[PDB]
Amino acid sequence: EPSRIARLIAVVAGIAGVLLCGLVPLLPVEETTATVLWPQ
Amino acid sequence: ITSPTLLKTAVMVLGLACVIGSIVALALLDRGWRRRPPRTRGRAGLWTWI
């Protein structure tokens, strides 16, 4: 029966859907830099 | 003016797929305790269309 399988999928994808979203604000991005020089 | 890297995009996609997977698993789990309705009252009337 598709019961003992869904019962563990709803957990291993419900906890790994919180632990994988809790570290999104911390992952690295790439930032652009700007610099004005003088004289030119 | 940041821009997401490849690791951040991969994590953001693979952690958003897991939410839908878990909700689908819950929907499949709800097939046992669902309280089936008599399935009547399937019309609207006249003074609701007006």
User: How far is it, in rounded angstroms, from Cα B12 to Cα B16?
Assistant: 6
- Assess B5–A contact: CB distance below 8 Å, yes or no: yes
Contact A17, B18 (CB under 8 A): yes
Closest listed residue to residue A16, CA positions, set B12, B27, B18: B18
Alpha carbon separation from A4 to A1, B34, B36 (Å, rounded): 7, 18, 23
Distance CA A30, CA A26 (A): 13
Tell me how the structure was determined: cryo-EM
Of A9, A20, A31, the CB nearest to B14: A20
Q: In chain B, which among 10-49 make CB contacts under 8 A with chain A?
A: 11-12, 14-16, 18-19, 21-22, 25-26, 28-29, 32
Resolution, expressed in angstroms to one decimal? 2.9
- DSSP 3-state assignment of B3? strand
Q: Phi-psi bin for A30: left (phi > 0), alpha (psi -120 to 50), beta?
A: beta
Q: Phi and psi for B14 in degrees, rounded to 5?
A: -75, -20
Q: Are B8 and A28 in contact (CB under 8 A)?
A: yes
Mutation for testing the A interface, residue in B9, B16, B19, B30 having most A CBs under 10 Å: B19
